[PDB]
XYZ file of C-alpha atoms in Angstrom:
595
model
C 69.204 3.651 75.785
C 66.954 0.654 74.980
C 67.451 -2.872 73.592
C 66.090 -2.712 70.042
C 67.555 -6.211 69.618
C 64.726 -7.282 71.945
C 62.217 -4.882 70.326
C 62.815 -6.350 66.869
C 62.364 -9.895 68.166
C 59.263 -8.962 70.200
C 57.594 -7.009 67.370
C 58.170 -10.052 65.175
C 56.849 -12.590 67.704
C 53.594 -10.871 68.760
C 52.399 -9.209 65.511
C 48.965 -10.269 64.229
C 48.205 -8.573 60.884
C 44.951 -8.659 58.901
C 43.915 -12.209 59.883
C 44.842 -11.818 63.580
C 47.483 -14.589 63.673
C 51.298 -14.229 63.370
C 52.465 -12.921 59.976
C 56.195 -13.343 60.758
C 56.311 -16.505 62.900
C 55.156 -19.017 60.275
C 57.169 -16.937 57.840
C 60.110 -17.546 60.143
C 59.415 -21.291 59.965
C 58.976 -21.142 56.175
C 62.233 -19.238 56.049
C 63.437 -21.944 58.461
C 62.088 -24.495 55.993
C 63.209 -23.254 52.574
C 66.226 -21.413 54.009
C 65.195 -18.046 52.491
C 67.983 -15.470 52.142
C 65.971 -12.296 52.951
C 63.243 -10.877 55.205
C 59.592 -9.980 54.667
C 59.496 -6.768 56.719
C 56.161 -4.957 56.121
C 56.530 -1.357 57.317
C 53.140 -0.439 58.797
C 53.178 -3.202 61.424
C 56.101 -1.823 63.444
C 54.967 1.792 62.998
C 51.675 0.791 64.643
C 53.577 -1.051 67.408
C 56.458 1.237 68.383
C 56.390 4.798 67.037
C 60.159 4.719 67.626
C 61.380 1.350 66.332
C 59.979 2.517 62.980
C 61.265 6.103 63.243
C 64.933 5.016 63.324
C 64.284 2.272 60.764
C 63.885 5.260 58.436
C 66.798 7.496 59.408
C 69.110 5.311 61.519
C 68.727 2.734 58.733
C 72.443 2.396 57.852
C 73.193 1.332 61.417
C 69.686 0.081 62.366
C 69.792 -2.574 59.660
C 73.070 -4.119 60.814
C 71.613 -4.882 64.240
C 68.154 -5.944 63.011
C 69.793 -8.837 61.138
C 71.672 -10.070 64.201
C 68.643 -10.662 66.443
C 66.976 -12.081 63.349
C 69.900 -14.521 63.018
C 69.917 -15.092 66.790
C 66.338 -16.182 67.622
C 66.587 -18.176 64.390
C 69.597 -20.194 65.565
C 67.562 -20.900 68.715
C 64.545 -21.869 66.588
C 66.906 -23.683 64.196
C 70.637 -23.919 64.850
C 70.848 -26.064 61.699
C 70.565 -22.818 59.702
C 74.217 -22.230 60.660
C 77.013 -23.700 58.491
C 74.545 -22.797 55.741
C 73.500 -19.124 55.896
C 75.457 -16.681 58.055
C 74.014 -13.476 56.572
C 70.264 -12.799 56.816
C 69.452 -9.382 55.318
C 66.201 -7.830 56.486
C 64.267 -6.466 53.505
C 61.904 -3.714 54.604
C 58.717 -3.338 52.570
C 56.408 -0.306 52.547
C 58.201 2.974 53.283
C 56.295 6.264 52.835
C 59.160 7.863 50.856
C 58.453 7.540 47.129
C 61.174 9.545 45.371
C 60.640 10.821 41.849
C 63.900 9.750 40.230
C 65.586 13.183 39.761
C 63.900 14.749 42.802
C 66.464 13.234 45.219
C 68.539 16.297 46.029
C 71.143 16.298 48.864
C 68.420 16.178 51.563
C 68.067 12.467 50.736
C 71.654 11.194 51.144
C 72.097 8.180 53.441
C 68.410 7.498 54.091
C 66.559 4.295 53.188
C 63.757 5.119 50.702
C 61.666 3.654 47.824
C 61.870 4.587 44.124
C 59.603 4.027 41.095
C 61.037 3.732 37.591
C 62.295 1.520 34.774
C 65.161 -0.957 34.801
C 67.538 0.191 32.063
C 70.584 -2.133 32.037
C 71.944 -5.150 33.932
C 75.368 -6.761 34.277
C 75.632 -10.528 34.857
C 76.715 -12.358 38.055
C 79.886 -11.480 40.012
C 81.428 -12.000 43.470
C 82.931 -9.811 46.231
C 84.176 -10.074 49.843
C 82.456 -9.333 53.179
C 84.664 -11.051 55.806
C 88.125 -12.647 55.422
C 90.129 -15.166 57.471
C 93.872 -14.643 56.866
C 96.595 -16.498 58.809
C 99.278 -14.772 60.927
C 102.281 -16.381 59.187
C 104.828 -16.358 61.999
C 106.362 -19.439 63.638
C 104.693 -18.239 66.851
C 101.110 -17.750 65.666
C 100.402 -18.944 62.116
C 96.884 -18.717 63.587
C 93.957 -17.678 61.380
C 91.105 -15.381 62.428
C 88.166 -13.575 60.817
C 89.924 -10.316 59.900
C 86.853 -8.063 59.483
C 85.658 -8.004 63.114
C 82.556 -5.966 64.130
C 82.398 -4.289 60.701
C 82.188 -5.173 57.002
C 85.211 -4.832 54.703
C 85.432 -1.672 52.569
C 85.278 -1.642 48.729
C 89.076 -1.959 49.017
C 90.778 -3.045 52.222
C 94.183 -3.827 53.842
C 95.506 -6.043 56.681
C 95.842 -5.497 60.474
C 99.404 -5.499 61.823
C 98.520 -6.815 65.279
C 97.668 -10.448 64.568
C 94.195 -10.814 66.080
C 95.516 -14.036 67.600
C 99.026 -12.827 68.474
C 98.929 -9.011 68.419
C 102.228 -9.209 66.547
C 103.460 -8.156 63.093
C 104.385 -10.656 60.364
C 102.555 -12.052 57.333
C 98.863 -12.910 56.873
C 97.898 -15.092 53.894
C 94.221 -14.737 52.958
C 92.287 -18.019 52.659
C 89.641 -18.933 50.058
C 88.013 -21.848 51.935
C 86.692 -19.827 54.911
C 85.896 -16.492 53.209
C 82.524 -14.701 53.011
C 81.442 -14.211 49.380
C 78.874 -11.695 48.071
C 77.012 -12.033 44.745
C 76.648 -8.503 43.294
C 74.787 -7.127 40.244
C 74.817 -3.500 39.055
C 71.882 -1.910 37.216
C 70.587 1.490 36.043
C 67.250 2.811 37.344
C 65.440 4.717 34.575
C 63.011 7.607 34.985
C 59.338 7.202 34.214
C 58.926 8.153 30.537
C 55.697 9.728 31.773
C 57.482 11.919 34.365
C 60.593 12.889 32.356
C 59.638 16.325 30.978
C 58.999 16.786 27.239
C 62.209 18.013 25.607
C 64.220 16.620 28.531
C 65.828 13.168 28.166
C 65.322 10.213 30.564
C 66.941 10.101 33.996
C 68.973 7.056 35.026
C 70.313 6.595 38.556
C 72.731 3.904 39.717
C 71.306 0.812 41.386
C 72.803 -2.213 43.106
C 71.512 -5.771 43.431
C 73.286 -8.365 45.577
C 73.029 -11.877 47.073
C 69.475 -13.306 46.825
C 68.287 -10.091 45.127
C 70.588 -10.806 42.141
C 69.088 -10.189 38.672
C 65.640 -11.283 39.923
C 64.328 -8.618 37.558
C 64.849 -8.494 33.788
C 66.035 -5.034 32.785
C 63.262 -3.068 31.047
C 61.105 -3.555 34.112
C 58.591 -1.558 36.156
C 60.830 -0.622 39.039
C 59.760 -0.205 42.602
C 63.060 -0.154 44.460
C 63.805 0.391 48.138
C 67.431 1.136 49.117
C 69.995 3.650 50.431
C 72.633 6.008 48.939
C 76.289 7.012 49.630
C 79.419 8.020 47.666
C 80.854 6.099 44.699
C 84.022 6.539 42.596
C 86.486 4.353 40.619
C 90.117 5.420 41.166
C 89.870 7.871 44.086
C 92.113 8.588 47.112
C 94.315 9.877 44.287
C 93.636 13.588 43.703
C 93.333 14.415 39.994
C 90.356 16.741 40.519
C 87.351 14.429 41.117
C 85.632 16.582 43.754
C 82.174 15.288 42.920
C 81.129 11.636 42.667
C 77.616 10.413 41.809
C 75.358 8.511 44.228
C 75.121 4.792 44.918
C 71.657 3.389 45.552
C 71.576 0.137 47.482
C 68.179 -1.154 46.336
C 67.539 -3.826 48.941
C 63.863 -4.474 48.255
C 62.406 -4.236 44.744
C 59.082 -5.123 43.183
C 58.542 -5.912 39.502
C 54.993 -4.815 38.709
C 52.413 -6.334 36.340
C 49.769 -3.546 36.072
C 49.264 -0.001 34.624
C 48.533 3.567 35.979
C 45.004 4.319 37.253
C 41.980 6.442 36.303
C 38.887 8.275 37.637
C 35.255 7.284 36.800
C 33.954 5.861 33.481
C 32.145 9.142 32.722
C 31.218 7.860 29.257
C 30.153 4.234 29.644
C 26.905 5.189 27.845
C 28.989 7.130 25.295
C 29.434 3.554 24.126
C 25.779 3.436 23.046
C 26.170 6.761 21.148
C 29.048 5.318 19.180
C 26.772 2.328 18.613
C 25.848 3.979 15.301
C 29.541 4.081 14.279
C 31.582 2.060 16.796
C 34.548 4.171 15.751
C 32.657 7.464 16.023
C 35.294 7.495 18.741
C 38.371 6.887 16.595
C 36.840 9.024 13.882
C 37.500 11.930 16.199
C 41.231 11.207 16.648
C 41.947 11.734 13.018
C 39.777 14.840 13.347
C 41.588 15.788 16.552
C 44.605 16.269 14.327
C 42.572 18.651 12.129
C 45.001 17.284 9.593
C 42.463 14.706 8.487
C 39.365 16.864 8.928
C 36.216 15.803 6.980
C 38.778 14.254 4.590
C 39.887 11.573 7.037
C 41.900 8.548 6.026
C 40.763 5.162 7.280
C 44.270 4.365 8.576
C 43.773 7.241 10.966
C 41.168 5.195 12.842
C 43.156 2.083 12.054
C 46.189 3.506 13.839
C 43.826 3.860 16.762
C 41.952 0.710 15.791
C 45.432 -0.553 16.452
C 46.285 1.643 19.364
C 43.117 1.587 21.425
C 42.196 -2.065 21.017
C 45.244 -4.297 21.208
C 43.113 -6.967 19.595
C 45.317 -8.682 22.138
C 45.835 -12.104 20.694
C 47.640 -14.683 22.727
C 48.013 -18.387 21.972
C 50.111 -21.249 23.365
C 51.021 -22.578 19.942
C 54.834 -22.526 20.252
C 54.346 -19.007 21.658
C 52.792 -16.148 19.683
C 52.233 -12.699 21.164
C 50.260 -10.592 18.711
C 49.948 -6.866 19.283
C 48.146 -4.432 16.949
C 51.190 -5.244 14.823
C 52.997 -2.956 12.403
C 51.464 0.164 10.899
C 53.562 1.556 8.063
C 53.510 5.112 6.766
C 56.055 6.843 4.528
C 56.154 10.238 2.745
C 56.778 13.975 3.159
C 53.130 15.009 3.592
C 51.154 14.925 6.812
C 53.471 13.002 9.133
C 51.575 14.820 11.876
C 50.524 11.614 13.647
C 53.505 11.855 16.061
C 51.814 14.760 17.822
C 48.801 12.465 18.302
C 51.169 9.555 18.906
C 52.593 11.429 21.839
C 48.923 11.727 22.759
C 46.493 8.926 21.809
C 47.209 6.592 24.717
C 48.294 9.574 26.795
C 48.675 6.762 29.313
C 50.832 4.488 27.067
C 53.504 3.197 29.470
C 55.982 3.749 26.627
C 55.717 6.022 23.588
C 59.168 6.555 22.174
C 59.474 9.450 19.748
C 62.214 8.342 17.419
C 64.235 11.002 15.854
C 65.363 7.474 16.167
C 68.747 6.478 15.233
C 68.633 8.388 18.535
C 71.225 7.147 21.010
C 73.021 4.100 19.530
C 72.324 1.739 22.408
C 68.792 3.115 22.351
C 67.781 2.065 18.789
C 66.918 -1.569 19.663
C 68.842 -4.289 21.516
C 72.540 -3.951 22.335
C 74.903 -5.833 24.665
C 78.500 -4.643 24.281
C 81.978 -5.988 25.030
C 84.712 -3.389 25.848
C 83.724 0.263 26.483
C 80.817 -1.332 28.277
C 83.437 -1.754 31.042
C 83.772 2.063 31.192
C 80.306 3.707 31.263
C 77.868 0.851 31.953
C 78.761 -2.762 31.168
C 76.446 -2.584 28.202
C 72.936 -3.903 28.490
C 71.655 -0.910 26.512
C 68.165 -1.649 25.283
C 65.923 1.371 24.692
C 63.806 1.741 21.540
C 63.150 -1.952 21.519
C 62.971 -2.746 25.203
C 61.311 0.230 26.823
C 58.411 0.057 24.399
C 57.505 -3.066 26.421
C 53.792 -3.500 25.680
C 53.413 0.114 24.581
C 53.655 2.267 21.471
C 56.875 2.809 19.569
C 57.577 5.784 17.295
C 60.006 5.696 14.395
C 60.522 8.957 12.463
C 63.340 7.602 10.309
C 62.705 3.869 10.041
C 64.807 4.075 6.885
C 67.798 4.656 9.160
C 68.553 1.280 10.806
C 71.646 -0.905 11.386
C 71.920 -4.385 9.848
C 71.176 -7.350 12.180
C 69.959 -4.658 14.564
C 67.072 -5.111 12.156
C 67.404 -8.920 11.818
C 66.645 -9.005 15.528
C 63.986 -6.308 15.033
C 62.427 -9.242 13.225
C 62.733 -11.659 16.166
C 61.361 -8.757 18.169
C 58.336 -8.080 16.036
C 58.251 -11.866 15.348
C 57.808 -13.448 18.775
C 57.356 -10.175 20.705
C 60.792 -10.466 22.310
C 64.538 -10.549 21.527
C 67.007 -13.189 22.750
C 70.606 -11.932 22.919
C 73.509 -14.092 24.101
C 77.251 -13.665 23.510
C 79.246 -11.680 26.066
C 78.693 -13.329 29.432
C 74.975 -13.272 29.891
C 72.183 -13.843 27.514
C 69.779 -10.941 27.693
C 66.189 -11.875 26.963
C 63.381 -9.318 27.321
C 59.702 -9.988 26.622
C 58.712 -6.566 25.258
C 55.526 -7.119 23.230
C 54.256 -3.724 22.055
C 52.654 -1.677 19.258
C 54.966 -0.843 16.327
C 54.505 2.461 14.499
C 56.936 3.751 11.848
C 57.478 6.841 9.716
C 59.200 6.265 6.406
C 61.573 8.671 4.788
C 59.651 9.477 1.593
C 62.277 7.780 -0.568
C 61.358 8.577 -4.176
C 57.568 9.177 -3.979
C 57.047 7.589 -7.417
C 55.515 4.763 -9.578
C 54.424 2.816 -6.510
C 51.014 2.426 -8.161
C 51.083 -1.007 -9.811
C 54.359 -2.394 -8.389
C 55.936 -3.406 -5.047
C 56.645 -2.059 -1.595
C 60.325 -2.932 -1.908
C 61.022 0.731 -2.707
C 61.412 3.677 -0.274
C 62.496 1.566 2.716
C 65.214 -0.335 0.907
C 66.202 -1.752 4.262
C 63.172 -4.013 4.557
C 63.025 -7.076 2.329
C 61.042 -9.558 4.423
C 60.946 -7.280 7.457
C 58.560 -4.977 5.621
C 56.138 -7.852 5.139
C 56.470 -8.414 8.908
C 53.805 -5.683 9.288
C 49.996 -5.606 9.089
C 49.073 -2.224 7.515
C 50.026 0.021 4.584
C 49.965 3.771 4.289
C 51.408 6.099 1.629
C 51.341 9.902 1.234
C 52.726 11.501 -1.918
C 52.745 14.787 -3.884
C 52.499 17.981 -1.853
C 51.119 19.229 -5.217
C 48.585 17.038 -7.062
C 46.646 15.842 -4.037
C 46.522 19.067 -1.969
C 43.364 20.462 -3.604
C 41.676 17.153 -4.499
C 41.686 16.472 -0.742
C 39.943 19.575 0.594
C 37.729 18.769 -2.381
C 36.232 15.581 -0.922
C 35.262 17.699 2.132
C 32.618 19.104 -0.103
C 32.274 16.089 -2.435
C 31.481 13.378 0.127
C 30.501 16.050 2.676
C 28.341 13.468 4.381
C 31.700 11.852 5.327
C 29.956 11.871 8.661
C 32.578 11.117 11.303
C 33.828 14.740 11.237
C 33.393 16.422 14.650
C 30.413 14.106 15.447
C 31.758 12.778 18.775
C 34.267 15.639 18.515
C 34.439 15.487 22.322
C 37.266 13.080 21.677
C 38.855 15.182 24.386
C 42.466 15.383 23.349
C 44.404 13.429 25.966
C 41.217 13.365 28.056
C 39.196 11.027 25.885
C 42.620 9.773 24.984
C 42.680 8.748 28.618
C 39.495 6.766 28.037
C 40.924 5.407 24.829
C 43.822 4.497 27.102
C 41.514 3.309 29.877
C 40.095 0.939 27.288
C 43.363 -0.964 26.864
C 43.562 -2.691 30.217
C 39.941 -3.428 31.121
C 38.404 -3.851 27.652
C 38.805 -7.608 27.603
C 38.429 -9.158 24.194
C 35.346 -11.211 23.365
C 35.599 -14.495 21.418
C 33.727 -15.061 18.159
C 30.409 -16.001 16.581
C 29.472 -17.464 13.189
C 31.756 -14.706 11.856
C 34.826 -16.848 12.592
C 34.272 -19.395 9.779
C 32.539 -16.703 7.695
C 35.656 -14.542 7.857
C 37.691 -17.708 7.470
C 35.858 -18.098 4.155
C 37.102 -14.601 3.277
C 40.471 -16.001 4.382
C 39.909 -19.030 2.211
C 38.510 -17.677 -1.048
C 40.695 -14.528 -1.197
C 43.538 -16.874 -0.270
C 43.672 -18.287 -3.806
C 47.253 -18.170 -5.217
C 49.359 -15.353 -3.682
C 52.775 -14.558 -5.257
C 54.465 -11.501 -6.826
C 57.803 -11.121 -8.690
C 61.324 -11.715 -7.257
C 60.808 -13.970 -4.191
C 57.864 -11.779 -3.106
C 56.029 -14.799 -1.716
C 52.886 -14.825 0.413
C 53.860 -18.458 1.207
C 53.939 -17.683 4.928
C 51.091 -15.142 4.625
C 48.837 -17.915 5.967
C 50.290 -16.644 9.208
C 50.568 -13.059 7.915
C 46.781 -12.856 7.753
C 46.037 -14.117 11.220
C 46.957 -11.081 13.279
C 45.673 -9.050 10.323
C 42.307 -10.658 10.722
C 42.644 -11.220 14.454
C 43.116 -7.576 15.456
C 40.274 -6.480 13.230
C 38.172 -8.412 15.715
C 39.077 -6.438 18.834
C 39.654 -3.329 16.728
C 35.894 -2.746 16.967
C 36.104 -4.368 20.356
C 37.393 -0.919 21.209
C 34.849 -1.415 24.011
C 33.648 -4.868 25.079
C 32.170 -6.497 21.937
C 34.302 -8.684 19.607
C 32.059 -11.400 18.167
C 29.757 -9.007 16.316
C 29.106 -8.891 12.581
C 29.782 -5.197 13.235
C 33.167 -6.407 14.440
C 33.432 -8.680 11.411
C 32.757 -5.731 9.100
C 36.294 -4.546 9.788
C 37.726 -7.607 8.041
C 35.996 -6.163 4.947
C 38.213 -3.051 5.051
C 41.133 -5.117 6.330
C 40.267 -6.658 3.015
C 39.912 -3.632 0.768
C 43.336 -2.484 2.013
C 44.950 -5.709 0.884
C 43.411 -4.755 -2.514
C 44.754 -1.161 -2.679
C 48.362 -2.202 -2.403
C 47.312 -5.252 -4.439
C 46.023 -3.067 -7.318
């Protein structure tokens, strides 16, 4: 009907944009400068130009693309012939399609189309090569002439030779060359459902994804995934019957975007609710315990702490040989009120990752794992879940006690410098997943822990335990029961008990979660050196029995102190004496497991 090969060129040449210039022309020249292996196709522009050239770009994609690249390569060779001998392929990467598929929503009515998908990178293979166009030689005394075999079309995922020698038209032999052969750099990956959008009770959805050429590995798995690309039919040993009627999809994610921000909110309907809390900063937090109605008027400090770990970050960063402090480790163990998981689910009802760990869970899931055999069968193994996915979020651990060996020794590295660095198989996987650690301890022998050590009850953790920042214990479902609902009367004035009760479960939690991203941390006042003096004087000879050495506690006080700062900076005030005050409980609590 019409020459789209001209349309594509003309829509590229004339387009203005938001500055009224030429948003593709100088991009052409910059592509013609750097020799860039992909296109910067922004979707709105063409849709506002030709209500047709964009229509097909959606549906006719599979074909439409093939052509679009040609005229791209054409006018380029005119603008710069010197791009030849270098790049032959061009690949137009479209950016900004209206189709935003929820991972498991893509029923049959999607197949073939080019669409965009939001999710979480789950696994990644290393680098590998394939074929796109061959140049075999018609081995016959007549011809022996070599020609690009794959003419007009790309070679299939398995292909075989043409009898009629393209040169001769005759049948003989055709030896495939390696010098003049088109190579493609592929990388397979698994696109993981939004932990937010995967229904409670239902496990995460992962759909196949493909990265090739310039797109290769440009995203570290465990990543916020925007991914544009098509779908088809994918098997392994087909053409042979067996029974394999079905075969899962095959996304061809051409244009991805690794994000750096969180999910949005309404209006700050309680900015002033800051001032109300200004009697008890944590009059907030002191309604998250309460929210549980497990704490009640007999709340435990740690309750707020958990939050004064959650909703705060304390976010410490520092370019001293890299140190990424989060709210660090909170440690609870027992058989009592392990009800925090219900509020863990909640709390930062926005938390990008909150992994409930009945958590030996799935093996690959428990931390960081890159495998070397059965990997080849169902995902060349870059299986990182519990560890990875947390990724600047909150991690739940209902059976911390149940962990594998060095799978913990890395759990150190992880909790140590935020991130794990795995190398062995082919690639080295490194993921920078700095998040909030939260762990439930199997109540191993709830006994004689008063005046002793915390070596007991975990039995896994020897130094790893000490890699945390808080301590929580909950014992007899007998002796304490009454004494607890006693305090309710005894220190009835325990005042943060339905005071700002309007800690709207998952609603105020939203605010508590809204806090995270915007609530930038303030610096310090004369409290710095003052607290330092509480980190000097209290820091007089620290050592217990059997290698239990606070000889690197110098460090293991920093975060401790540090996060106490922005703990109260639950909303935009860190320097305060009020903020300092925390350090005085972040003191008392050193004392309680100290004696």
